[PDB]
């Protein structure tokens, strides 16, 4: 366990929300290091916590934000690539 991914995918989300909203909404539970939005964004966002213990405890829990129902889950998709088609 060199670096256990503590990022969770908040599905069933919208675009109206902002990294600040969720970041502040998840700040009451623990210490959300930061909040990023990977693209293409599909009603889901990536959130990082300062502790995996907080990202796991939420895994499987249903939280309501602004009235909507978000699903907290921990997933880590595989991929290999590196930007740089041409030198220049």
**Breaks in the chain after residues (C–N exceeding 2.5 Å):** none
Please state, in angstroms and rounded to a whole number, the distance separating the CA atoms of residues 8 and 88.
36
Q: Minimal CA–CA distance to 16: which of 39, 40, 45?
A: 45
Task: Say how many Å lie between the first and final Cα of the chain, rounded.
Answer: 38
Q: Across-strand partners of 48? A: 7, 34
Q: Which stretches of the chain are DSSP H helices?
A: 19-25, 52-57
The residues, ordered by sequence, that sit 6+ positions from 33 with a Cβ below 8 Å of its Cβ are: 48, 49, 50
* DSSP assignment letter at 52: H
Residue 44 burial (CB < 10 Å; 0-12/13-18/19+)? Answer: middle
Q: Which domains, from first to last, does the chain contain?
A: 1-78 (3.30.70.330)
């Amino acid at each position: 366990g060199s670096s256990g991914s503590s990022g969770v995918f908040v599905g069933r989300c919208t675009g109206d929300m902002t990294e600040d909203e969720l970041r502040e909404f998840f700040s009451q539970y623990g210490d959300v290091m930061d909040v990023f939005i990977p693209k293409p964004f599909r009603a889901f966002a990536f959130v990082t916590f300062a502790d995996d213990q907080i990202a796991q405890s939420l895994c499987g829990e249903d939280l309501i934000i602004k009235g909507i129902s978000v699903h907290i889950s921990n997933a880590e998709p595989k991929h290999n690539s590196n930007s740089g088609p041409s030198s220049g």
